[PDB]
Design a protein around this nucleic acid. Structure first.
Ligand SMILES: [K+]
Ligand SMILES: [K+]
Ligand SMILES: [K+]
Ligand SMILES: [K+]
Ligand SMILES: [K+]
Ligand SMILES: [Mg+2]
Ligand SMILES: [Mg+2]
Ligand SMILES: [Mg+2]
Ligand SMILES: [Mg+2]
Ligand SMILES: [Mg+2]
Ligand SMILES: [Mg+2]
Ligand SMILES: [Mg+2]
Ligand SMILES: [Mg+2]
Ligand SMILES: [Mg+2]
Ligand SMILES: [Mg+2]
Ligand SMILES: [Mg+2]
Ligand SMILES: [Mg+2]
Ligand SMILES: [Mg+2]
Lengths: 49, 167, 49, 271, 159, 204
RNA sequence: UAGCUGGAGCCCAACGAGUUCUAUCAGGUAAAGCCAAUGAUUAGAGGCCUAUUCUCAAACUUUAAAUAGGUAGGAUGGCGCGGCUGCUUCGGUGAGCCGUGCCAUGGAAUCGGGCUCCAAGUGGGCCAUUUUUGG
RNA sequence: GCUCAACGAGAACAGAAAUCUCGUGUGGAACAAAAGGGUAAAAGCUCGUUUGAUUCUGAUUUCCAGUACGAAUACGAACCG
RNA sequence: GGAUGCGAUCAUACCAGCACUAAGGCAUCGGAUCCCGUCAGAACUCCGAAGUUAAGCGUGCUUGGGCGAGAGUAGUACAAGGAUGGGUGACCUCUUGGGAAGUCCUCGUGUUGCAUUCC
């Protein structure tokens, strides 16, 4: 249930869905709890565009 | 130190009589202390049931009295006279107190022909300032330099009643 | 025949279907149970406004 | 003692270890109803030393007690009383002086003038129905509250001064246990020093040698047993008129002094 | 009732802290509580009047009533589907003022002062907290660098 | 007789000591824990070997006594009754229950056993360096009495103390070790200065 | 009987949230301790005592986590001026409330639309990672 | 108002335990009862006065359906110790 | 640099053993008519002011015990999440996070309010 709730606040309700997250302590500790369910990194301009 | 406050005086003298039962013996025992002090003696109850001594709980078995002033000075003088001024080294406690016994109160002077009775003499020696340990407010210990120990108490008996400590 | 005695299994899932209901925050909280002195006095002061 | 004893010992409050405060009594004296909020409970603190009488109006805060007004016996010579500064009479004078001082501070002295002549019986200043009299609670401390205790002499003085102190008459000097009532005549005698004056008469005649040594400062000041009533009567009137670094101990040693001394002692044992 | 008494399994909960028994300090007794204030509930086992049930130990709530020797405290309790705002009266010995809004109360005063300056200067500002974020770039001078290496395993020194 | 040790080998329960709540507990089989020269000075035996358990399991009082006897007998015969000190380092404090259908199955005491973990020392032998090889053989014979896996480890300490040999000798030269049986307390820099003796007071 | 569910609606759109962050409370489980109290327990050393020493505890404990628990993070706030009280105070002294004029850039992140009625079925459960009792 | 268990040193009968005295004493005692908490100018012991173990209903807590009963707590309105 | 009264915190403040203190205040101290009080003016109470700093109180010292803060123990013990991880198992690895406690060593031994008052 905790993993289900966090992935709802990140809007990741489906597999292979992608979002942009801005970095701060609040968001990073949210991501650590759903680490096994997710892959993330730092995008570049080509990726964003 | 030769401070004039550091003089040893008798704080009080306690005469104990321990009969072990209640009845005419205790009442005649109490009267002897009435004669020798002038104040009503206070009885002491038993605290345990002991078959060997034949005493039950809360039974009047003994009586005693506390004397201070010149009266206790004269009683101690007459009591120590019965010993002919011959105490023992063991008789002195290390807190500055000593005692002895009297087999028969007839040697104290009173004829009392109440009966035949002895008594336990105990005498507390103290200096001034002992009030600090007995006053209600701001209780405190009396300080080692103002305390009476065995050395002073034994010296006090030697030079006041020309008494000799036996070994 | 013996049966099961007690379990909390599925009870918290049942409690979150209509997820835990917080009472409605109302201005003017009820004065019931307040000490009757200062309650009648407040009533008298309002009456004499 | 053992180190296990020290490890598990809990120290009492500091003023309990000093034997100066009954914390059960102080709790019931200072604890205020919570629906009275920051309204303070005032105390009427009366303390006797071997030579002085201390009277204070005190209320308690977090940082410590705060005094509203204080009075002492040793300042009574400024008004006219120089001897017997710890008897029932001077206790009455101290209580009267403190009561006059507080009423001045709160602008209540004119509104509440108590008994201006030390009546000698039970008194309570009647509330004026617009401004109630100042209310304080007597705090006696560790003394034993006996009948005729000087703390009730100061209580009587504060009552005559104009303060509202919840009390009874069962402990004034003069109350009879076998009759359950107070002798206001005997009380007035104590308030004006009659019990002391009777002793002087009961000493100047039969034992003049004891009389001189006992009441020495009375004689040296020329006070006689017949001037006491006028002396205390003038003091009460006078109070109601104008009631208003070389170091000698050692300091603690420093680290560089403590260790320097230690090197010398350790070598001395070693050699 | 019904299998468990009022103070059941409170052997550690209601015990006093170590070497902290005996007298109760005067600070406990002359703290001031008003309606709307926040207080923590902490039972102490020497005071048996006004004792709250063991559930409210360690909970923070609002003051809703004040009496002579006690205060009314409002505490949330989850009972199945919902939260019930429980209202209990507790003696002052088992209650302490809460610091759960101390940082908020000072910040509100400061935000008022900061927005006051923006009024004088004519600017528009935020005074809104922001979580800790990514650090900006920076340089470190050439200094000593210590080399860290895996250590060979030793059987004897394992214990 | 009694159940085979496999029935109680694994640590499954919470500790169940003999106490006021557990009564009627038969006594342990092992009553002696030190054999050989127990009253031997700390400066005599610098050699120390250990039998270290590498498993987390129960060890019975029976298995402890059998190992003690087997370790002891080889040492006395092949090295002398005077040349060693052997110490059992585990005490059986756990009570095993036996339920002698399933209604009211809580069991009565069966026996006592020790609860041991990985790295826990089971046995210790202190001797001289000339007999250190015989010490490994007696510990090797002892390990056949225990269930599971055990290792024999050459300790770095001097005898039964907590001091390494390189530092026990360094302290001894400096005059800073007072021998109390086998314990060899290392005196320091605290306590009354008058409590020390000329040569036994050290700054820092 | 309450909970879980459907149907009927109705009332509205700042309010919230099976989450984090900032701050602040509470705890005695793991571990540890016995060279600290209670209890158990091996051994020597020096003079019953002293200083050490091996090993322990669901119904022992000074210390004491991780994970979980509670609270708060403004417009339902604040400040003046003026009133009311039969409550409170020595006292406009306080506690509140009433009226009135001003102030309050929305007070961390992320996400997002959310009062009453009537009733059904259910009230044998089972399995798995981790913790855990009896055997 | 007082301080308990226990210990140390003392006093004819009287010793391991009869009664008295001084010193130490964080509770190692006691508090009807089981166990756990709690308490030292007390909540323990001794003495003095007493009947609040009283009247009227409300509210809250524990159980909880958040019903009842039992038990408890904080007020109010009396009358008392 | 001191005190006294009433306190706050309630050992950095306690405990043990030693040493010392101007002025003042405290205190010890003298007495038992009166109030009061006991077997006992010891205590409590009342009245005093001959003597004393002996005690108390205050301050300091000790390679003191305890208490408090550090460092270290130690990224150890334990523990949240993950693995179609290793192993016969007991258990243990790695990955994303949190993170203790004795011994040992160092340092410290109070701060402070209101009123009056001494230098
Ligand atoms: K049970
Ligand atoms: K084996
Ligand atoms: K520990
Ligand atoms: K222990
Ligand atoms: K049903
Ligand atoms: Mg089944
Ligand atoms: Mg069923
Ligand atoms: Mg009292
Ligand atoms: Mg029931
Ligand atoms: Mg099991
Ligand atoms: Mg436990
Ligand atoms: Mg454990
Ligand atoms: Mg249904
Ligand atoms: Mg009990
Ligand atoms: Mg009751
Ligand atoms: Mg006298
Ligand atoms: Mg002195
Ligand atoms: Mg120290």
């Amino acid at each position: 249930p905790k993993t289900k709730k966090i992935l709802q606040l990140l809007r990741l309700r489906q597999i292979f869905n992608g979002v942009f997250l801005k970095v701060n302590k609040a968001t990073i500790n949210m991501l650590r709890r759903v680490e096994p369910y997710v892959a993330y990194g730092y995008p570049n301009l080509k990726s964003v565009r | 130190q030769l401070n004039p406050m550091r003089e040893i005086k008798v704080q009080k003298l306690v005469l104990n009589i321990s009969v072990g039962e209640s009845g005419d013996r205790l009442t005649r025992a109490a009267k002897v202390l009435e004669q020798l002090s002038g104040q009503s003696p206070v009885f002491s109850k038993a605290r345990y049931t002991v078959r060997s001594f034949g005493i039950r709980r809360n039974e009047k078995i003994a009586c005693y009295v506390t004397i201070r002033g010149e009266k206790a000075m004269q009683l101690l003088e007459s009591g120590l006279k019965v010993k002919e001024y011959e105490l023992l080294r063991r008789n002195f406690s290390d807190t500055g107190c000593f005692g002895f016994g009297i087999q028969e109160h007839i040697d104290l002077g009173m004829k009392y022909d109440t009966g035949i009775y002895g008594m336990d003499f105990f005498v507390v020696l103290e200096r001034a300032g002992y009030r600090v340990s007995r006053r209600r407010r701001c209780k405190a210990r009396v300080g080692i330099h103002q305390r009476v120990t065995k050395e002073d108490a034994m010296k006090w008996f030697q030079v006041k009643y020309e008494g000799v400590i036996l070994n | 025949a013996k049966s099961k005695n007690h379990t909390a299994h599925n009870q918290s899932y049942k409690a979150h279907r209509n997820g835990i209901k917080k009472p409605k925050r109302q201005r003017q909280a009820s004065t019931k149970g307040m000490d009757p002195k200062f309650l009648r006095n407040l009533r008298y002061s309002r009456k004499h406004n | 003692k053992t180190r296990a004893y020290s490890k598990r010992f809990q120290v009492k409050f500091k003023r309990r270890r000093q034997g100066k405060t009954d914390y059960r009594a102080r709790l019931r004296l200072t604890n205020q109803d919570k629906n009275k909020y920051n309204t303070p409970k005032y105390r009427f603190v009366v303390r006797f030393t071997n030579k002085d009488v201390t009277a204070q109006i005190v209320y308690a805060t977090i940082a410590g007690d705060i005094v509203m007004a204080a009075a002492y016996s040793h300042e009574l010579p400024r008004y006219g009383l120089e001897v017997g500064l710890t008897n029932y009479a001077a206790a009455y004078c101290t209580g009267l002086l403190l009561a006059r001082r507080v009423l001045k501070c709160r602008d209540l002295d004119q509104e509440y003038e108590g008994n201006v002549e030390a009546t000698g019986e039970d008194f309570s200043v009647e509330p004026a129905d617009e401004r109630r009299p100042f209310r304080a609670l007597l705090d006696v401390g560790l003394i034993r509250t006996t009948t005729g205790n000087r703390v009730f002499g100061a209580l009587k003085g504060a009552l005559d001064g104009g303060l509202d102190i919840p009390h009874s008459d069962k402990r004034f000097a003069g109350f009879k246990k076998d009759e359950k009532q107070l002798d206001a005549e005997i009380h007035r005698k104590y308030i004006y020093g009659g019990h002391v004056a009777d002793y002087m008469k009961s000493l100047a005649d039969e034992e003049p040698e004891k009389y001189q040594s006992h009441f020495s400062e009375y004689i040296k000041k020329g006070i006689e047993a017949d001037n006491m009533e006028a002396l205390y009567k003038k003091v009460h009137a006078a109070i109601r008129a104008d009631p208003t670094h070389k170091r000698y101990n050692p300091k603690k040693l420093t680290y560089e002094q403590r260790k320097a001394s230690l090197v010398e002692r350790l070598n001395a044992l070693n050699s | 009732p019904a299998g468990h008494g009022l103070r059941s399994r409170t052997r550690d909960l209601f015990a006093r802290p170590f070497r902290k028994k005996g007298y109760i300090p005067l600070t406990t007794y002359l703290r001031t509580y008003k309606v709307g204030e926040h207080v923590d509930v902490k039972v102490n086992g020497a005071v048996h009047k006004g004792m709250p049930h063991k559930f409210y130990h360690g909970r923070t709530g609002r003051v809703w009533n004040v009496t002579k020797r006690a205060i009314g405290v409002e505490i949330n309790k989850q009972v199945g589907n919902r939260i019930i705002k429980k209202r209990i009266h507790v003696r002052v010995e088992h209650v302490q003022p809460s610091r759960c809004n101390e940082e908020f109360l000072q910040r509100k005063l400061n935000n008022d002062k900061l927005k006051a300056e923006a009024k004088v200067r004519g600017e528009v500002i935020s005074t809104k907290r922001q979580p800790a974020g990514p650090k900006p770039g920076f340089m470190v001078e050439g200094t000593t660098i210590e080399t860290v290496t895996p250590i060979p395993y030793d059987v004897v020194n394992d214990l | 007789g009694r159940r085979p040790a496999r029935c109680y080998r694994q640590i499954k329960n919470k500790p169940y000591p003999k106490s006021r709540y557990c009564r009627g507990v038969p006594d342990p089989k092992i009553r002696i824990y030190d054999v050989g020269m127990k009253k031997k000075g700390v400066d005599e035996f610098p050699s120390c070997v250990h039998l270290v358990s590498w498993e987390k399991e129960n060890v019975s009082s029976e298995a402890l006594e059998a190992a003690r006897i087997a370790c002891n007998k080889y040492m006395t015969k092949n090295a002398g009754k005077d040349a060693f000190h052997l110490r059992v380092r585990v005490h059986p404090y756990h009570v095993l229950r036996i339920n002698k259908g399933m209604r009211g199955a809580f069991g009565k005491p069966l026996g006592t056993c020790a609860r041991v973990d990985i790295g826990q020392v089971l046995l210790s032998v202190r001797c001289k360096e000339s007999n250190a090889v015989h010490a490994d053989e007696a510990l090797r014979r002892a390990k056949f009495k225990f269930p599971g896996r055990q290792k024999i480890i050459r300790s770095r300490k001097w005898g039964f103390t907590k001091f390494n040999r390189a530092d026990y000798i360094k302290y001894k030269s400096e005059g800073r070790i007072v021998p109390d049986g086998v314990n060899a307390k290392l005196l320091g820099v605290h306590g009354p200065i008058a409590k020390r003796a000329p040569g036994q007071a050290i700054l820092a």
